[PDB]
């Protein structure tokens, strides 16, 4: 159903010489589609999905122009923040920024976000209603007043409910072959013996898209979280994802245990036995 577009900016100061390293990436749902890297020779926003290539040189010049403006904003930010926090000119610091929009199964605006961190910690963020700000400390309180006075929230809100959503809709269309295709998990179970009385069952999910998924073990029809190990979902490297979950059971009792898989790509929860 739902879809999202998200942009990610990181800046990292280099004390000693030159401008900060700067890295921007754009995502639709779980698929990365653009990138800019300050330490790359092109000095341009660069396509990272086949469906974005269609776009003309006026898209690429405008995006570059804005992504370069961002880095200079991040550069200035590191200097000011370094003043607000009375820190030395010698340490290396990081600013992070994230924003984007979500749409439900009608591709109408649903949710929007825009937030900022300094050295990995909440700094300032836009509220759910897109009208006000959360400032985590007093230095962010200063920034909030500045942004309140110069009407930043207004501009952002128009972009998030306007532009963002409209180009998301654009991308979903030009990219339907991949972006609107769910890839259901291919599942299988493995079995391993640890001692002569105790076994391990491992339930796998592979090649599925999007990333969101649920894998759970049941015992005689009841949920079971004890003696079970669940790995962080991980990228396969070809645009799909993998995840497994394991349970330790007594030898011979393998058959009371069922693994349960839930994915947007499945009509109904899949069930696996040994």
């Amino acid at each position: 159903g739902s879809h999202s577009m998200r942009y990610f900016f990181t800046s990292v100061s280099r004390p000693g010489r030159g401008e900060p390293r700067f890295i921007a990436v754009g995502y639709v749902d779980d698929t990365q589609f653009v990138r800019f890297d300050s330490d790359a020779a092109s000095q341009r926003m660069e396509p990272r999905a086949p469906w974005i290539e269609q776009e003309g040189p006026e898209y690429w010049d405008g995006e570059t122009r804005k992504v370069k403006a961002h880095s200079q904003t991040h550069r200035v930010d590191l200097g000011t923040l370094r003043g607000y926090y009375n820190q030395s000119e010698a340490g290396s610091h990081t600013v992070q920024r994230m924003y984007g929009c979500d749409v439900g199964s009608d591709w109408r605006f649903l949710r929007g976000y825009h937030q900022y961190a300094y050295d990995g910690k909440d700094y300032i963020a836009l509220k759910e209603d897109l009208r006000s700000w959360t400032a985590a400390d007093m230095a962010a309180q200063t920034t909030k007043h500045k942004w309140e006075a110069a009407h930043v929230a207004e501009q952002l809100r128009a972009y998030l409910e306007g532009t963002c959503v409209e180009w998301l809709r654009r991308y979903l269309e030009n990219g339907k072959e991949t972006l609107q295709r769910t890839d259901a998990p291919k599942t299988h179970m493995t079995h391993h013996a640890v001692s002569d009385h105790e076994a391990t069952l491992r339930c796998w999910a592979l090649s599925f898209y999007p990333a969101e998924i649920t894998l759970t073990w049941q015992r005689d029809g009841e949920d079971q979280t004890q003696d079970t190990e669940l790995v962080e979902t991980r990228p396969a490297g070809d645009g799909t994802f993998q995840k497994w979950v394991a349970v330790v059971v007594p030898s011979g009792q393998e058959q009371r245990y069922t693994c349960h898989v839930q994915h947007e790509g499945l009509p109904k929860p899949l069930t696996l036995r040994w």
Binding site: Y7, E63, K66, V67, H70, T73, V76, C164, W167
Partner: peptide, 9 residues
């Protein structure tokens, strides 16, 4: 599609 303008902290 990136946001057009940006403000410093």
């Amino acid at each position: 599609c990136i946001n057009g303008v940006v403000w410093t902290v």
